[PDB]
Amino acid sequence: SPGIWQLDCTHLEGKVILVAVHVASGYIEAEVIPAETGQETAYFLLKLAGRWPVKTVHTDNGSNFTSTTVKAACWWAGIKQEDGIESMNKELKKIIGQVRDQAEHLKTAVQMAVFIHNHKRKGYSAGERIVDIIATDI
Amino acid sequence: SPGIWQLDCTHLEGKVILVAVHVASGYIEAEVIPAETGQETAYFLLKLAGRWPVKTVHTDNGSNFTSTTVKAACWWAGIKQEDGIESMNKELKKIIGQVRDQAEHLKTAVQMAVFIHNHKRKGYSAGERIVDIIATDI
Numbered sequence A, B: 001s002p003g004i005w006q007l008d009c010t011h012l013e014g015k016v017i018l019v020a021v022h023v024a025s026g027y028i029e030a031e032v033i034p035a036e037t038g039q040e041t042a043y044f045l046l047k048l049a050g051r052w053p054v055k056t057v058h059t060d061n062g063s064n065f066t067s068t069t070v071k072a073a074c075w076w077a078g079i080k081q082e083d084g085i086e087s088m089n090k091e092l093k094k095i096i097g098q099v100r101d102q103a104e105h106l107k108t109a110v111q112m113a114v115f116i117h118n119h120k121r122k123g124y125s126a127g128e129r130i131v132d133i134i135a136t137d138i
């Protein structure tokens, strides 16, 4: 379904990479934060929902599902917060490793990996698939 | 044209709001930074280009057009960096003012305004128009 997203967390270099995957296409958005908190997750969802038509988010764990702050952001943004990827984290870490030496900051390497992941043709790319899926829904 | 974006800067509360407008649709992405620098602009463009198919960016001023750091990000992301909105800044500041009391942080009010701006039906919204324009290009 065009509006379904899945949250995902992974660790790297003492930091956390928070990822949102558009389930039907494999398209991703990602950010680097010091640690996963309800405030960081709520702010990340608010950003994602202003950029794509987010109908449902499958939270990554029970703490984010429980968080009053995350629930408040889902309420504000009109998101249906729902309850309950390893290959995606491994592939994303693999791309980060291939670009790591071109970037001083981890956040720069992570955005380079988001770019490569979304543009990779598998032939359509994930960026093309998300747009085609949502335009068909309009 | 589907791949053309325009950068825009505005000031609020001692901070800078950096905006990227998809010219054909009026869709926006925005971020709050302490001040406009070549590093912040380069990082913002790298994020935008991993999320949308960015072919051309009309920089907001000569400093960003000149910046070796911005040029390096445009080279990395495959963006054609080009040279040379008031109503958009005024409308965005108007929305920020209507939500300002619902947010402690300026960045939260700015993302709420990006959400409202992109979802507002004028009837299609800017979020629907950007997706339809890019899907037609695919």
Ligand SMILES: Cc1nc(C)c([C@H](OC(C)(C)C)C(=O)O)c(N2CCC(C)(C)CC2)c1-c1ccc(OCCc2ccc(F)cc2)cc1
Binding pocket: A102, A103, A104, A105, A106, A108, A109, B038, B039, B040, B042, B043, B046, B068, B069, B071, B072, B073, B075, B076
């Ligand atoms: C000086 C500098 N500092 C930092 C901290 C970063 C990155 O951080 C942020 C700026 C916040 C994204 C980082 O995390 O590494 C830089 N980028 C590295 C990543 C890149 C996306 C390529 C943008 C520049 C650069 C930099 C500047 C210029 C540069 O120039 C190469 C020759 C070049 C010049 C012009 C061109 F058009 C093409 C290549 C190389 C690196």
Ligand SMILES: Cc1nc(C)c([C@H](OC(C)(C)C)C(=O)O)c(N2CCC(C)(C)CC2)c1-c1ccc(OCCc2ccc(F)cc2)cc1
Binding pocket: A038, A039, A040, A042, A043, A046, A068, A069, A071, A072, A073, A075, A076, B102, B103, B104, B105, B106, B108, B109
């Ligand atoms: C405690 C708190 N601190 C901060 C700093 C922020 C914002 O910052 C970030 C978290 C980083 C985005 C800010 O900048 O103001 C908050 N949000 C305000 C903005 C919002 C998008 C609604 C998310 C929560 C909240 C907060 C938490 C909970 C809350 O709950 C209402 C009743 C409620 C509870 C559950 C619901 F499902 C619906 C309403 C209200 C405000």
